[PDB]
Amino acid sequence: VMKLIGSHASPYTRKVRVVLAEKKIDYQFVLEDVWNADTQIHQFNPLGKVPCLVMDDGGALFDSRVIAEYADTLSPVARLIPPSGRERVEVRCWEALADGLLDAAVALRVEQTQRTPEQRSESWITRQHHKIDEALKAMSRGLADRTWCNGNHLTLADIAVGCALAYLDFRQPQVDWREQHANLAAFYTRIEKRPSFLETQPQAENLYFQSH
Amino acid sequence: VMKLIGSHASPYTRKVRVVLAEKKIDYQFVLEDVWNADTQIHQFNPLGKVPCLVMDDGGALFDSRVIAEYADTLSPVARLIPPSGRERVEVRCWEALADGLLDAAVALRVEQTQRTPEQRSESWITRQHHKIDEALKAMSRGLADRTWCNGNHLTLADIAVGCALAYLDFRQPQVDWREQHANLAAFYTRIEKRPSFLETQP
Ligand SMILES: N[C@@H](CCC(=O)N[C@@H](CS)C(=O)NCC(=O)O)C(=O)O
Numbered sequence: 001v002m003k004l005i006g007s008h009a010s011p012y013t014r015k016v017r018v019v020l021a022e023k024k025i026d027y028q029f030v031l032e033d034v035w036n037a038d039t040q041i042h043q044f045n046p047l048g049k050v051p052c053l054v055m056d057d058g059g060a061l062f063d064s065r066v067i068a069e070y071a072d073t074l075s076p077v078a079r080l081i082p083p084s085g086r087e088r089v090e091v092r093c094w095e096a097l098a099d100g101l102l103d104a105a106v107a108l109r110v111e112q113t114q115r116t117p118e119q120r121s122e123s124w125i126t127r128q129h130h131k132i133d134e135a136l137k138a139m140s141r142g143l144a145d146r147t148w149c150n151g152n153h154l155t156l157a158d159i160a161v162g163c164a165l166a167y168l169d170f171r172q173p174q175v176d177w178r179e180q181h182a183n184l185a186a187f188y189t190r191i192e193k194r195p196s197f198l199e200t201q202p203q204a205e206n207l208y209f210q211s212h
Numbered sequence: 213v214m215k216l217i218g219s220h221a222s223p224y225t226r227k228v229r230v231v232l233a234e235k236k237i238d239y240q241f242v243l244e245d246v247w248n249a250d251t252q253i254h255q256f257n258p259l260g261k262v263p264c265l266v267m268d269d270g271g272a273l274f275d276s277r278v279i280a281e282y283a284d285t286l287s288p289v290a291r292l293i294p295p296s297g298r299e300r301v302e303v304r305c306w307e308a309l310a311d312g313l314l315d316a317a318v319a320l321r322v323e324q325t326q327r328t329p330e331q332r333s334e335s336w337i338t339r340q341h342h343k344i345d346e347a348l349k350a351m352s353r354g355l356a357d358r359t360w361c362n363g364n365h366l367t368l369a370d371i372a373v374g375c376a377l378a379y380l381d382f383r384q385p386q387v388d389w390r391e392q393h394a395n396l397a398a399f400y401t402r403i404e405k406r407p408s409f410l411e412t413q414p
């Protein structure tokens with residue numbers, strides 16, 4: 001059984017976990033804190049980042065885009081990445097847009113946890129918030145009046161966007177993306193109820209589902 | 213004619229330019245300084261980053277991985293990304309490894325240019341250097357005694373690795389990766405002679 005190294009908070013890890021659930025691929029979720037000085041992540045991912053997927057023979061796969069792509073090939077349940085042409089490139093670009101929103105939001109989390117108050121840069125903070133604001137505008141423009149980001153069914157584009165919006169709710173709740181973008185609010189209401197999203201909420205890090 | 217927005221220094225841009233040269237795809241290179249406060253990059257890329265490809269219809273594509281993949285489908289010259297199977301995943305992972313080395317090296321550049329001396333973190337700098345060191349080790353182990361990263365022909369894996377090693381020469385010239393990794397030194401001596409690399413130096 002493959003092992004996915006990650007954390008409950010990590011939105012790149014969540015993207016992979018959602019893909020694995022949609023694809024009905026069995027895996028073992030292995031919790032790791034990459035920010036701990038005693039982390040073992042570099043024994044598996046040379047970049048020291050999560051998610052990292054480890055196979056039965058010890059082979060390791062990264063990053064989240066590579067893992068998600070690989071996972072779509074492992075099962076016939078759903079087709080999360082179109083095989084070719086225009087729809088595929090669109091789905092890949094949507095994933096990059098969502099991942100870039102995540103890159104900016106995660107940069108903000110790093111500015112909080114990895115810098116002392118005296119080291120923090122207001123210009124860097126502004127820059128990342130500008131990226132989030134503009135990424136949200138593009139997501140709203142791209143989705144328009146449609147049910148899904150691309151074509152007529154859930155793809156990796158929707159999964160990625162869903163994880164990004166959820167990550168804003170979790171770490172950046174002051175960004176009122178729902179008020180700014182009605183179509184994203186509606187989109188998220190539709191995607192958040194999927195079992196794959198319900199089972200992978202970052203808020204599950206607080207151990208709530210271990211209570212009797 | 214498609215426009216590629218980027219800079220000469222940007223290694224993610226260079227990866228795309230080498231791909232476009234290898235695919236013999238015609239394009240116009242448009243220079244932009246994304247770090248400048250008055251940059252216009254957000255008109256085309258919501259993420260405010262380069263590279264960004266603007267097609268004839270006005271459609272914008274990003275990031276470098278997406279652009280490289282799209283470019284491979286546009287032209288029948290070379291086969292940079294395998295169609296399926298183990299070979300494709302291997303090539304995608306090689307690109308991620310090289311892009312991750314870039315991410316760390318670019319973070320080190322950003323630490324110096326976007327932060328004042330009082331804002332810089334030595335623990336963060338150490339962390340990014342550790343990633344570069346470990347990425348180089350993984351690239352050396354992955355390549356072993358082979359000529360190409362994957363299969364027996366030029367792929368996006370070779371291109372991405374070449375761009376990463378060259379970016380270390382450019383911005384981290386004190387990192388003596390050749391001494392530590394003879395196979396990467398030999399690899400780079402081969403790849404830097406390709407016209408695609410010769411014409412895209414930072
Ligand atoms: N490009 C990566 C990004 C992964 C990433 O930055 N993950 C964070 C945790 S959410 C991390 O492991 N950072 C640790 C570090 O950079 O040292 C992906 O898409 O998987």
Ligand SMILES: N[C@@H](CCC(=O)N[C@@H](CS)C(=O)NCC(=O)O)C(=O)O
Nearest residue numbers: 222223224246261262263275276277
């Ligand atoms: N994931 C992107 C990274 C691109 C990137 O971060 N490029 C740098 C220039 S080398 C940039 O535009 N940084 C500007 C910013 O983050 O504001 C890719 O692979 O193309």
